[PDB]
Design a protein around this ligand. Structure first.
Ligand SMILES: CC#C[C@]1(c2cc(NC(=O)c3ccc(C#N)cn3)ccc2F)N=C(N)OCC12CC(F)(F)C2
Length: 365
């Protein structure tokens, strides 16, 4: 219930994500590693890419073991490829343990490392099913739990130069107010959840709830935006446009093609009702414009965007909440974050219970 050593173990820069300090190899090589609940590989820079402060030097490690197997990982914005091995991995501001884990040594990439960022690898915290090349490659957290007495959960407080906490193996009650409310992990691949209802300023979108989860809904710390399926986004922007019609803005702003510069109260709250733990029971999470209007260094980007890969509950959602990935119990907890950005009139909320029928119909098959 209290893990003072792991509080404030996350750093970052606005729009560049949250990283934790890790050590790989013997003797230990310190690296900054992006915390990513949306993927399942531990993959680290291993060559002198000019964007990198530092990189894994396998030759300096007595505990390195070659798996003699490559991995090629394309995605929409470029790619990464590497050489698979294992080594001793530890987290200085995490539990006092050392695990042998899979490491993908990154040897070629495109649009992967960010120019000007301060991280040099990615910690994929999701499940084996989506690991590359396949589900036989054991994710870091699976190895951590198998090899130690660290309980099978972690929690994230993303605050938003940004900070936060990754509490590994537990919950720190000082990081949130009120109660945690839990939604079932629908399937152990991504952190998949089911959205059963959507409100803008209390006004229901009145869509078949299957649309909210077309073709999935996930909790992803490795994504900035709240991403909504095309049809849902269309309807969401329509209602946000109406609620905020005091001032007019160009079409492009709502498409994230332009910025807007200067006002919070003109903008509506967004509420996602999540499937609860009990038959016919749900709960609601509520975010402010402070979450979905991203400061760009007074200009702001509209951080709700359309998607073809489902709902992505990225930093826009997570910065309002303390988020518990309760792997042991196949559930994700949300509670109001003790660090979220708010004004004197509105705060992010987690509320329940609500009565919602046919919640199982909301999941896509
Ligand atoms: C390994 C891996 C992976 C990725 C990935 C994520 C990122 N993410 C970021 O750079 C980022 C920036 C700002 C925030 C905030 N707040 C969070 N994350 C970069 C490269 C990736 F490659 N991880 C996530 N969650 O989604 C995108 C992918 C690329 C993919 F293959 F489609 C998966």
């Amino acid at each position: 219930g209290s893990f003072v050593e792991m509080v404030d173990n996350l750093r970052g820069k606005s729009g560049q994500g949250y990283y934790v300090e890790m050590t790989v190899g013997s003797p230990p090589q310190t690296l900054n590693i992006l915390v990513d609940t949306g993927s399942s590989n531990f993959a680290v820079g291993a060559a002198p890419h000019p964007f990198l402060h530092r990189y894994y030097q396998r030759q300096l490690s007595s505990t390195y073991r070659d798996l003699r197997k490559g991995v090629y990982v394309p995605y929409t914005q470029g790619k990464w490829e590497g050489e698979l091995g294992t080594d001793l991995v530890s987290i200085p501001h995490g539990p006092n343990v050392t695990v042998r884990a899979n490491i993908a040594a990154i040897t070629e990439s495109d649009k992967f490392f960010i120019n000007g960022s301060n991280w040099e690898g990615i910690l994929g915290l999701a499940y084996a099913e989506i690991a590359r090349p396949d589900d036989s490659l054991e994710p870091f957290f699976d190895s951590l739990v198998k090899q130690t007495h660290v309980p099978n959960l972690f929690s994230l407080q993303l605050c938003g130069s940004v900070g936060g906490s990754m509490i590994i193996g537990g919950i720190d009650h000082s990081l949130y107010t009120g109660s945690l409310w839990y939604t079932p992990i629908r399937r152990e691949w991504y952190y998949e959840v089911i959205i059963v209802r959507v409100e803008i300023n209390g006004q229901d979108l009145k869509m078949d709830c299957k649309e909210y989860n077309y073709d999935k809904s996930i909790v992803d710390s490795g994504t900035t935006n709240l991403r909504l399926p095309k049809k849902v986004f269309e309807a969401a922007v329509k209602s946000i446009k109406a609620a905020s019609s005091t001032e007019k803005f160009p079409d492009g702003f709502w498409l994230g093609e332009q910025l807007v510069c200067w006002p919070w109260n003109i903008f509506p709250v967004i509420s996602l009702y999540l499937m609860g733990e009990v038959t016919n029971q749900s709960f609601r999470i509520t975010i402010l414009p402070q979450q979905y209007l991203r400061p760009v260094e007074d200009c702001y980007k509209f951080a709700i965007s359309q998607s073809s890969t489902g709902t992505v509950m990225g930093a826009v959602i997570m910065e309002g909440f303390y988020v518990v990935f309760d792997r042991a119990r196949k559930r994700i907890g949300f509670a109001v974050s003790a660090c979220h950005v708010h004004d004197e009139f509105r705060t992010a909320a987690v509320e329940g219970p609500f009565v919602t029928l046919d919640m199982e119909d909301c999941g896509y098959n």
